[PDB]
């Protein structure tokens, strides 16, 4: 694969595929993209972190399960008795598996960023004229081991997110779309914005026929307003959209266009990161 | 309790205790204890970043189970055969449980930001003279749920770990003992450290403790945040002996199995001590704690 050279400087081998410890090189540019991310925030975005775990209950009622219960991952631990909890271990002593003993938790970590954000913004009653703006990121999980290092399993995204009419949500989409585009272009990044209701930013990184999805631009109509009972100014249930930037995505796009040495990256380039 | 009125300021709640959203109020002085920590880094120590998640191979072989298996959150999904999961998805439309078609993954959410960084280490061969320094960071998961402000299921962990010789080790903590003490004057923070133990699963696990405790292999930084009765341990100071060393093959520079220990700081646990101390406005935060900060 074209992109494997790159695991040298960037990544160490966890023992999972999909799953590496990142070096202080590759950190450096993530941390860099997110600071420009940030300097393109519209005035009245509120700031929120996700951790990477959210609620079972809440990702259910998201309809998530529904579209991709094959990538989800949910948290499980030992919930019994201690008896119980000491005879799993034991039987893991004795070669046997002590996982029987795990049950559910209330949590599953999260495969998409934006997600906790709408029932928080549904508690708060009905939406001022012109919506809600939030910027929210979490580290993401999707069940798809993979080998390629634009293929991973936990990774990092980054999300704007518009909660109010169709007319809100459209402008926000159009904004958005134009200001990804600037983004990518100052970034000396190769792209073209494709469908995938969903537009992709995709950058060829194995192929030029084969391009990675780096940025995505959704559309959710009333599906969360609905979800969490979501009232716009008018009373009417509140359209979604969300703007997504895939981190670790972003971080390889670089490193493959520009190359593991930063000081030969261009003066441009250089210079919208601050390096 | 104590805690709960800075709560408004610095969190929201996402439906479950102990897991919160961040504000950019909270998050910006996260960031400024992260790179403060940082300016403190110690020539040669090599940054690596860990996911939320790790090898449940590695974790199992680490000995975490003999320890906390209570704590353990693990990934779990739907790894069967598209009809199985698509019956699964039909049970929970159907008002049921989907739940019981999960098995576990290869994969566990991460309970210290160490673990991960013993294999690495490993597979380089011979440590050199005076060892290897890492700085490791990850989210890290422990199953305790509470409505408490500094004790959370999702919590962000910081460390410094050394591998090499005992006297390699043992310097590095008493250095960190002391360095990390600066660390939390200069940030206004009222402290002492004490001997300590960690919370061993069980009947066992009280013994455990009372053994670690007086061979004095764990010493923690304790904040008052409710009173000096109870402090909350924001750091910890842990001496390993060889238990990574021989679990993973990690020969020192005389060919003896490695010994290892970790400077760990507990990211949220600093963060709601900073405000718990100081107030949510940055702006009235003292002059001398405000300037290392960089505010
Ligand atoms: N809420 C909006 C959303 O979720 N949208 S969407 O596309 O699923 O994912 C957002 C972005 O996350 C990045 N991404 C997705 N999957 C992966 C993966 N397996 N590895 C690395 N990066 C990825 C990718 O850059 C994608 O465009
Ligand atoms: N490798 C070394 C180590 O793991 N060490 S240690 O077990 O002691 O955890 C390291 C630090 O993480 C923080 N911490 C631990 N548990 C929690 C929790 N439930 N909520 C918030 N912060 C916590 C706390 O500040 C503790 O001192
Ligand atoms: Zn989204
Ligand atoms: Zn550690």
Redesign the interface.
């Known amino acids: 694969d074209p992109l494997d050279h790159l695991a040298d400087k960037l990544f ?5 595929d999909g ?6 090189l590759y ?1 450096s540019i993530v941390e860099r993209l997110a600071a420009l991310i940030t300097s393109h925030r519209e005035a009245g975005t ?10 079972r ?2 990702l ?1 009622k998201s309809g998530y ?2 579209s991709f ?2 990538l ?7 919930h019994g008795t ?1 008896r119980e ?2 005879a ?2 034991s039987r ?1 002593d004795a070669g046997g598996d ?2 029987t003993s ?1 049950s ?4 599953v ?1 999260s495969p998409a960023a934006c997600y ?1 954000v709408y ?2 913004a549904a ?1 708060r009653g009905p939406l001022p004229k012109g919506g809600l703006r939030f910027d929210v990121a979490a ?1 993401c ?1 999707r ?1 798809e081991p993979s080998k390629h290092l634009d293929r991973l ?3 990092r995204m980054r999300e704007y997110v518009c909660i109010g009419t169709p007319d809100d949500v459209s402008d926000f989409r159009e904004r958005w779309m134009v200001r990804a585009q600037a983004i990518a272009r100052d970034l000396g990044l190769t792209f073209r914005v494709d469908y995938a209701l969903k537009f992709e930013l995709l950058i060829p990184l194995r192929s030029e026929e084969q391009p990675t999805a780096c940025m995505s631009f959704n559309y959710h109509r009333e599906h969360f307003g609905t979800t969490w009972g979501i009232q716009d100014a008018n009373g009417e249930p509140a359209h979604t959209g969300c703007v997504a930037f895939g981190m670790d995505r972003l971080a390889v796009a670089m490193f493959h266009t520009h190359g593991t040495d930063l000081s030969a990256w261009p003066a441009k380039v250089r210079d919208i990161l601050g390096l």
């Open positions: 160490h081998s966890m023992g999972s799953v590496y410890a990142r070096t202080a950190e509120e700031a929120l972190r996700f951790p990477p775990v959210m609620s209950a809440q259910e399960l529904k219960p094959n989800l991952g949910c948290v499980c631990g030992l201690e909890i000491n799993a271990v893991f002590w996982t795990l559910p938790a209330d949590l970590l906790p029932p928080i508690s580290d999980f069940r399993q936990s990774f």
